[PDB]
């Protein structure tokens, strides 16, 4: 495995002149705050998880510009029902990198943020100018469980320095990287105790199955056991396509029942040194993810896949 | 200068998919009536009766709303924002869905729609529900052939093809064709939409045409890019039309035969092309490198014109 696993976390495709912020805002337990939510964000976010964004609607640009002038923190709601904008919990996201640019006269803002604190939603109110403000309450934050989880993680993929040592940070690493659906992510986000969070995760890893194509609900694509981490963030990560759409990707060493489309391409690659090719379901041709292929034959691995969470469903 | 290409192809939006469902039904609201019509949250374009609006919708709340629209009157409200940055709008126009197709990419439900502007309105109430959707309480508004010939005369002096069949015979439709196709900024579009009477609209448009100057790149303002005399129409919609990029972003572009102070980026491409038979290359300002639009180049030697430019309204300001 010869590849710098610190390059993906940099999101260099998004831009390399990104202004950086080192100030850190952290709210007290049980404190009630009013935090804006970005209307296009759909992701469930946990503390320690990074969220890259590319925004071009003038209202999102203005609100990020104002956040950058202040505490740089927005609210990422854990929607139980994104079609209905229903959410009871969420995680704050603190912008740590920022970039302005223009394209065709349209002001664009590129942002890189990281989850900081869980919160319970108290009120979701929309302003007269359309922007949404959420009144939230900041929630407060067993090495046997940790060792047991780390044990079954090594059984799935041979991956210590990669995993956090603190039980709180480790519980959130596991919550954000397990190949689980949204309902289980929200279940884990509701849990207040790291001990309880780790114990629920152990139960989830054991009931885990395999990943089928959602459009088929039949054809198996990959499994926990080919999960393969190419990034310090872990085997699961959010990346932005060239037009602002955020994909959550699970990297696996081998996949089944998948065809390729088009020509391997290096543009806007989420894994520097690698080229991507659209992978679709060999049964329904539903796009599922991308196969990445080395650009220099001196790199290991030579082939790996990055499959979107949204295209997969567990058995 | 002579055209050897089917100007009815661009209006079909075949790049959006050629197997679009269509609807024969037509809904029209009574004059001076209050209607409650939903507003798509990411639409930003100023719409006029008779104008086409293509869309590609990703958000599950958008596709739910449009799915429900397809099962009802297929009509949403397009606001003419004074300030998009703050959702400030006093007038608008209804858009009726006339074509539709559902897709699914990476497990994400996708809706593509082609809609046409029908009736303009004044907004009485904008109110966002609990789920986030915006509903607009609106009042449908009620709807000198010398001005018409005077308008048409200076249109021909800009482009020869803008002559007869390319232009509507009715003064109401004609004032809306002109409002949608003049190379004017958003403040003038809103001014024309506010006008209640067609004769008043036509006379305002004649005044605007006489004061029309040139189009400069927005970022640096100094460099001219094109001018009204270089306009020429390659679609039955007219010289000005909205098209969707492959990711759902709607671009309003003006087609012109010649542009200055523009460099090109890379090699021509035929993917997702808005003008079948032509390839596109990103065009950018010579001075400040800002992307301005696209140069279109024919893929066959027997096509005419062999080259033209589609320049976005958003990158251009008047002189
Ligand atoms: C016509 N265009 C489209 O439909 C969308 O185009 C895309 C979408 C996703 C990417 C990913 C691929 C993986 C990677 O490494 N980086 C990316 O941005 C690239 C282009
Ligand atoms: C990083 N950029 C991408 O991945 C692709 O972005 C685009 C944007 C606009 C187009 C237009 C060009 C003109 C035309 O005729 N059709 C289009 O769709 C095409 C691709
Ligand atoms: Zn399938
Ligand atoms: Zn310029």
Author numbering:
A (entry chain A): 47 to 187, 250 to 267, 270 to 425
B (entry chain C): 45 to 187, 250 to 425
Excerpt from the publication:
The ubiquitin E3 ligase cereblon (CRBN) is the target of therapeutic drugs thalidomide and lenalidomide and is recruited by most targeted protein degraders (PROTACs and molecular glues) in clinical development. CRBN consists of an unstructured N-terminal region and three folded domains: the Lon protease-like domain (Lon), the helical bundle (HB) which facilitates binding to the adaptor protein DDB1, and the thalidomide binding domain (TBD). We present the design of CRBNmidi, a construct that readily expresses from E. coli with high yields as soluble, stable protein without DDB1. Importantly, the stabilizing mutations introduced based on PROSS analysis proved to have beneficial effects, with the best-expressing construct (construct 8, hereafter referred to as CRBNmidi) incorporating 12 mutations.
Furthermore, to assess the suitability of CRBNmidi to study alternative, non-thalidomide scaffolds, we solved the crystal structure of CRBNmidi in complex with compound 1, a phenyl-glutarimide based binder, to a resolution of 1.95 Å. While compound 1 used for crystallization was a racemic mixture, only the (R) enantiomer fit the electron density well. The two protomers in the asymmetric unit capture two different conformations of the N-methylacetamide group in compound 1 indicating flexibility (2nd panel from top). Comparisons of the crystal structures of CRBNmidi bound to compound 1 and lenalidomide reveal that the glutarimide in compound 1 adopts a near identical binding mode to the equivalent moiety in lenalidomide (3rd panel from top). Together, these high-resolution co-crystal structures validate CRBNmidi as an enabling construct for X-ray crystallographic structure-based binder design.
